[PDB]
Design a binder for this molecule. Structure first.
Ligand code: CHL
Ligand code: CLA
Ligand code: CLA
Ligand code: CLA
Ligand code: CLA
Ligand code: CLA
Ligand code: CLA
Ligand SMILES: CC(/C=C/C=C(C)/C=C/[C@@]12O[C@]1(C)C[C@@H](O)CC2(C)C)=C\C=C\C=C(C)\C=C\C=C(C)\C=C\[C@@]12O[C@]1(C)C[C@@H](O)CC2(C)C
Ligand SMILES: CC(/C=C/C=C(C)/C=C/[C@@]12O[C@]1(C)C[C@@H](O)CC2(C)C)=C\C=C\C=C(C)\C=C\C=C(C)\C=C\[C@@]12O[C@]1(C)C[C@@H](O)CC2(C)C
Ligand SMILES: CC1=CCCC(C)(C)[C@H]1/C=C/C(C)=C/C=C/C(C)=C/C=C/C=C(C)/C=C/C=C(C)/C=C/C1=C(C)CCCC1(C)C
Ligand SMILES: CC1=CCCC(C)(C)[C@H]1\C=C/C(C)=C\C=C/C(C)=C\C=C/C=C(C)/C=C\C=C(C)/C=C/C1=C(C)CCCC1(C)C
Lengths: 311, 228, 41, 226, 212, 80
């Protein structure tokens, strides 16, 4: 009942129709009579109910265009990490955060506008940042500039994967209506797959990176002595020094006493009176506690096997 | 007709009949095809088989009859006999080149076209008889057999001995390379104490110098496998 | 290449491309010849 | 037939007795009655990656173990008895440096030459007979291929001409897949069995035979190296 | 026809007769028929400057093994105006004067093939008239040995060689640049460095191409 | 541990869930719940060797749901 069910080579990827503005709606294809045809084009471009009728044509256009937005958001995230890489003062902020103010953007000197570069800190001149990337990147255990270039590229790489997915799922292999008609599958997956797994995956980043790192920082070390990230998950005895319960391995998880982990999985509440943030031990215990609960909640809809509700 | 093919069950390739000398119908690379290639490859197989057969015998003749002078070297003007040794190899190689460059070009052009020039230049009153592409011998066979009597049967014995040499001679070059021993020497070692004289040992060592220079810093020796 | 040109000839494209040729030029004229109040030079 | 193997009502409809090694285990109905195509999910592809994954696995499994054993028996030298993941493929896990050159050079010759292998292979999958046409060093006659993409046949790839009677050909194929599927799981174990323990896979055959009741997964957690 | 990437078919627009046409236009920039003859000249020109550039780089390099004090191709610009005797401006501006003449002359024979040798450039009719193909002028000056006059079957067989030798001169002259920016040494120096210790002189060991 | 009291519980929890999950205690692939709480349909055609209508998916469901209560009881005891 729930299958893939896609078409093939539906449209034709070519510039034929780019040179013919208004090609979509029957009213616009006739070229401008007046200046309004220039305006009436834009308002009608993303309205897919005027274009066509059936949900196959509408939904494909809708689904294939979500890849567009995601391909834009990732070029955006990549750009924000890149300007954290080269143009930010981040290292200097990272060592003395209580003073240095956050900065990324840097202004070319021309037209007497370089005055916009403020004296900030870490021997640097640039615009202030209210975005809050720096105070995220500390909580993600990102220290050097190399982690940022790796996200900028990796972010800009996977962005290119989306537009291909966008191309691939409209022109080349386009699902049919029935595929978009499966809610209960879609809801099993989004709720379990995105949010359920995406919380574990992140609960697995915090435990092996942020929790160890952000302990070494507020302990008074600085990024120069901080072990590389892959040092943490590839060394137990390094990790066990921070939190002794790693010496217990995975037995306490399997021997079914989780009170063992009360060092690096806590329940605290309140703000940590050094960094000011929430105590980062329980935030891992947060996502973990949610992830387990989402994956549960993704199983309430039946798909093939006759287990779980229908709508 | 099928004589016997190399593997027990196999299909002799289409272009492979057994018209040629030693055909077992083995060309698994499918490399010979469009017989203009076959004619070419056959020539090499011959020429290689012959220089190997002369090579194998010449190596056994060296070491048996000159117990010193490790075979794989023999080149540099030390091992050379008494009349030589001071002929200045650069002048020895000079004497060879003009000799081989003629004969080989002489043979090559007789591959391009055929029956074209089988005749003597200079005196130009005489020629080698008919053949098929690489079996001359009006002069090259003075003794006249393999003419009236069985011919291809001697051709068959020619390859099967030739192919044996090309492998056997190859054994020489790799044996003498790893062991540092002439062919009959490394054989004598094996017969002595086989279990410890085996190829199991003395692999991972090419035991060859990388310079070996005569009138300069010359002649890099790249061995074969990178055994240290 | 036929149809790629015709698209590049649309109004907003040239409007972008050709202003970005002025904008760039007028920007760099101020790079080499800074602060031009009056035509005195 | 002997499906069992979680055979479904749908899964047995299209998929019954045909494909070599078909047990009717197809829980998600991926291979299907051509309801959709032009992707990496369809009967034409999924069969062909299954075979290929099988063959590499065979070459993987046999290649990960053999150096470990031959040094253990005291045959080849120990310096080359490096455990398969410590060969220098994964520098974080150690680098062997036994080789005549560095790993990066080897990876250039690989990528070049290995690409002539596989790009050559698609054009036979996308164009059934095409790679036996254009001149490639005269190898095209034996590299033309035959039948379906998964089995090339030809002169080289099957030289010994085994499976002639088409009675055994299916058998040999089924006999090949069942070894491929087994070969994969073997490799799938190594990656985990090496990360949980931290020792060789052959070393892990001894430790489980020295104290079978004890040395085990449920014994070894507190090990977990890396 | 032996296309690149065997097993495909050429882009449908160019199967035609062009010297060295392997059906390679993977971004489809020949799709404009008017523009193709502009790229065919563009290649021919680059191919001809390449083949002169490569020899111009190698020979002074190879000359340097025996001594004979030349520079490498890089930093041969300085060494000349180090010793100077004529200013840099006068040289670069004689370039633009003489060089611009040829190119802007080479162009209006491409635009309209009839002119440029109608006459009235110091006479010289039929020397500049051009032989009618895109990048082949022919004639007295550009073709002093009178080749490409006799047998055409032999000519079309050169026009193939010229490109294929040109496409290689370009792709090598991309190496001269790139392997200068990494190893910082001459082209024949590298051709000895890798022929001497091939193992530690390879590409992965320049420390630039393979960052860590 | 192997027989310590939490093992007493878990084997007696999950193995207890699908114990009579075999017959009539809970929903299975075949018999699905009604709103009026009938617990009867069983017309589903999955093919499994088994004496009466017990699918292999019924195993994963009942066991996996067995471990929640299994853990919820073991932690209900341990915390207390
Ligand atoms: C058109 C191709 C061409 C190429 C690839 C080069 C290559 C080079 N020239 Mg060169 N030149 C070229 C045309 C010409 N040069 C010169 C005369 C010079 C001089 C005097 C110098 C160069 C220099 C250079 C270097 C780059 C200069 C620079 O500022 O780099 C940064 C970007 C580089 C090796 C410089 C050099 O030798 O450095 C190694 C240098 O001093 N060239 C003339 C005569 C006007 C040219 C005519 O087209
Ligand atoms: C989130 C931003 C976003 C996204 C994802 C899309 C996505 C889309 N737009 Mg678009 N659009 C946007 C913003 C966006 N638009 C804005 C702000 C405007 C101005 C009002 C328009 C005006 C507009 C018009 C006028 C048209 C589209 C069309 C389209 C569709 C075809 C795109 C295509 O063929 O490009 C493929 C090529 C690329 C993706 C490469 C892009 C490279 C250049 C530089 C851009 C696609 C669904 C066309 C259509 O027919 O859709 C119904 C169309 O006619 N859009
Ligand atoms: C575990 C399974 C799974 C997962 C993780 C997702 C994930 C996603 N789906 Mg989705 N979907 C699934 C199964 C799944 N789907 C099934 C079975 C159906 C069929 C009914 C659908 C139908 C469907 C529709 C109709 C739409 C989505 C959309 C989305 C996106 C949510 C929008 C957003 O903010 O993303 C946040 C984005 C990220 C966090 C970035 C991560 C993205 C990477 C690439 C992970 C994507 C994995 C995904 C499963 C594809 C993998 C297979 C493919 C590589 C071959 C997200 C990427 C929406 C969307 O964006 O459309 C494009 C949307 O409109 N899905
Ligand atoms: C969901 C994401 C995720 C991922 C990818 C990992 C990955 C890893 N964990 Mg882990 N872990 C996670 C979540 C995750 N964990 C959670 C949520 C907890 C809390 C219970 C733990 C608690 C935990 C402990 C206590 C230990 C690991 C260890 C390990 C490493 C060895 C595991 C192993 O050999 O598996 C086989 C494949 C491995 C890198 C071990 C480690 O770091 O090495 C000593 C280790 O001792 N993990
Ligand atoms: C007829 C063909 C022929 C063949 C098969 C060989 C084969 C060989 N010669 Mg040789 N040689 C030949 C003709 C031939 N030579 C001629 C015509 C001359 C000039 C008279 C020499 C002069 C010569 C010298 C001076 C040396 C060799 C050496 C060698 C050996 C090593 C070559 C090497 O590693 O180079 C790698 C590339 C190898 C067995 C060298 C050797 O054995 O080094 C120990 C060595 O020193 N040969
Ligand atoms: C409408 C009123 C007005 C007027 C009369 C001007 C006039 C001027 N502005 Mg100005 N400006 C205006 C509005 C105006 N602006 C607005 C609305 C803003 C806010 C966006 C600004 C922001 C602004 C800045 C930030 C700057 C100027 C500058 C200048 C001066 C430099 C002109 C120049 O680039 O050299 C002339 C340029 C050329 C001649 C280049 C053309 C070359 C071609 C090839 C000639 C070819 C001939 C054949 C000029 C006097 C600059 C300056 O130094 O002022 C003191 C400067 O830095 N303006
Ligand atoms: C066997 C009997 C038993 C006992 C004595 C307990 C006792 C307890 N449970 Mg518990 N629990 C049980 C069965 C039991 N549970 C079962 C069968 C489940 C189903 C999985 C749960 C699921 C459960 C959850 C999800 C939570 C508790 C929590 C708690 C504690 C506080 C309860 C509260 O907030 O009010 C307390 C120690 C809460 C707590 O404080 O965790 C320790 C909590 O979050 N229990
Ligand atoms: C290919 C492979 C391994 C290849 C390894 C190679 C080449 C290794 C090479 C090396 O080691 C050597 C040689 C030497 C080493 O020193 C270095 C290297 C160079 C590294 C493993 C595949 C491993 C592949 C695996 C494990 C695949 C498992 C797939 C499963 C179980 C799918 C099941 C389903 O598809 C069905 C059956 C039915 C569907 O309806 C439902 C689902 C469930 C989806
Ligand atoms: C002309 C040229 C070199 C000229 C060299 C010269 C003048 C020499 C100069 C010097 O002697 C002097 C002056 C002074 C010396 O002291 C030093 C130097 C400086 C050295 C190189 C061209 C070099 C040009 C190169 C390498 C071009 C490569 C292009 C490729 C591969 C393009 C492929 C595609 O375009 C197609 C074919 C089809 C599309 O569909 C797909 C894509 C991919 C877009
Ligand atoms: C079969 C085999 C296996 C292992 C190696 C390999 C794979 C390569 C393969 C080998 C094939 C063969 C036969 C390679 C040939 C090698 C050799 C040695 C060729 C000839 C080398 C030397 C030659 C001409 C002459 C050298 C003498 C020179 C300069 C100068 C001598 C002189 C001096 C010293 C200075 C001035 C005076 C003068 C006369 C010039
Ligand atoms: C009935 C009987 C008599 C005659 C025949 C036969 C001998 C075969 C016998 C039949 C069946 C037998 C012997 C066994 C059947 C099933 C078995 C052994 C296991 C089946 C399911 C086991 C399960 C889910 C256990 C765990 C599964 C899951 C997801 C648990 C997930 C977890 C939860 C939700 C809490 C936190 C996270 C974690 C721990 C991952």
């Amino acid at each position: 009942k729930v299958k893939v069910i896609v078409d093939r080579n539906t449209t034709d990827t070519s510039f034929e129709k780019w040179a013919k503005p208004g090609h979509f709606s029957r009213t616009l294809a006739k070229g401008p009579t007046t200046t309004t045809w220039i305006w009436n084009l834009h308002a009608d471009a993303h309205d897919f109910d005027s274009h066509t009728s059936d949900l196959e044509d509408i939904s494909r256009k809708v689904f294939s265009a979500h890849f567009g937005q995601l391909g834009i958001i990732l070029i955006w995230l990549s750009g924000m990490y890149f300007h954290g890489a080269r143009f930010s003062n981040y290292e200097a902020w990272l060592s003395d955060p209580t003073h240095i103010k956050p900065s990324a953007q840097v202004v070319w000197p021309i037209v007497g506008q370089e005055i916009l570069n403020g004296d900030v800190g870490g021997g640097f001149q640039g615009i202030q940042i209210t975005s809050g990337f720096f105070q995220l990147w500390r909580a993600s255990g990102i220290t050097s500039e190399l982690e940022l270039y790796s996200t900028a590229l990796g972010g800009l790489l996977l962005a290119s994967a989306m537009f291909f997915a966008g191309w691939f799922h409209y022109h080349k292999a386009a699902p049919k209506l029935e595929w978009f008609q499966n809610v209960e599958s879609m809801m099993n997956h989004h709720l379990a797959g995105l949010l359920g797994l995406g919380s574990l995956g992140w609960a697995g980043h915090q435990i092996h990176l942020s929790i160890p790192i952000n302990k070494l920082l507020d302990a008074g070390v600085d990024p120069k002595e901080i072990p590389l990230p892959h040092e943490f998950l590839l060394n137990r005895e390094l990790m066990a020094g921070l939190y002794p319960s790693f010496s217990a391995g995975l037995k306490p998880f399997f021997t079914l006493n989780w009170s063992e982990y009360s060092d690096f999985l806590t329940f605290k509440g309140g703000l940590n009176p050094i960094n000011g943030g929430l105590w980062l031990t329980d935030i891992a215990h947060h996502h973990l506690a949610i992830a387990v609960l989402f994956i549960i909640a993704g199983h309430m809809y039946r798909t093939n096997w006759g287990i779980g509700h229908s709508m | 007709a099928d004589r016997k093919l190399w593997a027990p069950g196999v299909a002799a390739p289409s272009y492979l009949d057994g018209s040629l000398a030693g055909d077992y119908g083995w060309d698994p690379m499918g490399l010979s095809s469009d017989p203009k290639a076959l004619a070419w490859y056959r020539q090499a197989e011959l020429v290689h088989s012959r220089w190997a057969m002369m090579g194998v015998v010449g190596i056994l003749g060296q070491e048996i009859l000159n117990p010193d002078v490790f075979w794989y070297e023999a080149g540099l003007p030390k091992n050379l006999p008494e009349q030589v040794s001071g002929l200045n190899l650069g002048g020895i190689l000079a004497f060879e080149f003009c000799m081989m460059h003629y004969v080989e070009v002489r043979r090559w052009q007789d591959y391009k076209n055929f029956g074209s020039v089988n005749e003597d230049p200079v005196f130009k009153g005489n020629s080698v008889p008919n053949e098929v592409m690489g079996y001359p011998g009006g002069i090259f066979d003075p003794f006249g057999f393999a003419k009236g009597k069985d011919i291809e049967d001697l051709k068959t014995k020619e390859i099967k001995n030739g192919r044996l040499a090309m492998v056997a001679w190859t054994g020489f070059a790799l044996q003498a390379q790893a062991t540092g021993k002439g062919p009959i020497a490394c054989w004598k070692d094996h017969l002595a104490d086989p279990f410890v004289s085996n190829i199991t040992a003395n692999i991972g060592t090419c035991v060859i110098p990388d310079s070996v220079d005569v009138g300069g810093v010359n002649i890099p020796l790249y061995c074969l496998w990178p055994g240290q | 290449m036929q149809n790629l040109k015709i698209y590049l000839s649309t109004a907003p494209v040239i409007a972008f491309i050709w202003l970005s040729l002025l904008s760039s030029l007028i920007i760099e004229v101020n790079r080499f010849f800074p602060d031009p109040l009056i035509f005195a030079f | 037939k002997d499906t069992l193997f979680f055979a479904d009502e749908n899964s047995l409809t299209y998929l019954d007795g045909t494909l070599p090694g078909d047990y009717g285990f197809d829980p998600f109905g991926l291979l299907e009655p051509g309801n959709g195509d032009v992707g990496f999910i369809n009967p034409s592809w999924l069969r062909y990656s299954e075979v290929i994954h099988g063959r590499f696995a065979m070459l993987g499994a046999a290649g990960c173990i053999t150096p470990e054993i031959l040094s253990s028996l005291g045959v080849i030298p120990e310096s080359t008895g490096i455990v398969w993941y410590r060969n220098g493929v994964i520098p974080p896990a150690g680098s062997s440096d036994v080789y005549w050159v560095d790993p990066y050079t080897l990876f250039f010759v690989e990528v070049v030459a290995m690409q002539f292998a596989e790009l050559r292979r698609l054009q036979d999958y996308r164009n059934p007979g095409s790679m036996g046409k254009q001149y490639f060093l005269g190898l095209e006659g034996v590299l033309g291929g035959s039948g379906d993409p998964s089995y090339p046949g030809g002169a080289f790839f099957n030289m010994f001409n085994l499976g002639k009677t088409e009675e055994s050909m299916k058998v040999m194929k089924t006999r090949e897949i069942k070894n491929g599927r087994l070969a994969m799981m073997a490799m799938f174990g190594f990656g985990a069995q090496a990360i949980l323990t931290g020792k060789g896979p052959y070393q892990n055959l001894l430790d489980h035979l020295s104290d079978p009741f004890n040395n085990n997964i449920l014994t070894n957690w507190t090990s977990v190296y890396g | 026809r032996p296309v690149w990437y065997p097993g495909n078919s050429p882009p449908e627009w160019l199967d035609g007769s062009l010297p060295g046409d392997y059906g390679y236009d993977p971004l489809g920039l020949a799709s404009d028929p008017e523009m193709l003859k502009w790229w065919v000249q563009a290649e021919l020109v680059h191919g001809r400057w390449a083949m002169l550039g490569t020899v111009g780089m190698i020979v002074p390099g190879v000359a340097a093994r025996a001594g004979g004090d030349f520079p490498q191709w890089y930093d041969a610009g300085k060494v000349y105006i180090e010793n100077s005797s004529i200013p840099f401006g006068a040289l670069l501006m004689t370039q633009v004067l003489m060089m611009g003449w040829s190119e802007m002359m080479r162009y209006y024979e491409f635009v309209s093939p009839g002119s440029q040798g109608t006459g009235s450039f110091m006479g010289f009719t039929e020397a500049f008239a051009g032989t009618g193909e895109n990048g082949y002028p022919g004639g007295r000056f550009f073709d002093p040995f009178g080749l490409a006059k006799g047998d055409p079957a032999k000519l079309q067989e050169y026009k193939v060689k010229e490109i294929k030798n040109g496409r290689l001169a370009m792709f090598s002259c991309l190496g001269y640049y790139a392997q200068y920016a990494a190893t910082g040494k001459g082209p024949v120096d590298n051709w000895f460095d890798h022929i001497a210790d091939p193992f530690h002189n390879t590409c992965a060991t320049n420390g630039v191409s393979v960052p860590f | 541990f192997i027989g310590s009291t939490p093992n007493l519980i878990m084997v007696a929890s999950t193995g207890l869930c699908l114990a009579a999950g075999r017959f009539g205690l809970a929903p299975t692939v075949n018999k699905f719940a009604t709103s009026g709480l009938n617990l009867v349909d069983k017309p589903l055609g999955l093919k499994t060797g088994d004496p009466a209508g017990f699918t292999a998916v019924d195993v994963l469901a009942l066991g996996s749901f067995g471990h929640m209560i299994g853990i919820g009881i073991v932690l209900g005891l341990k915390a207390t």
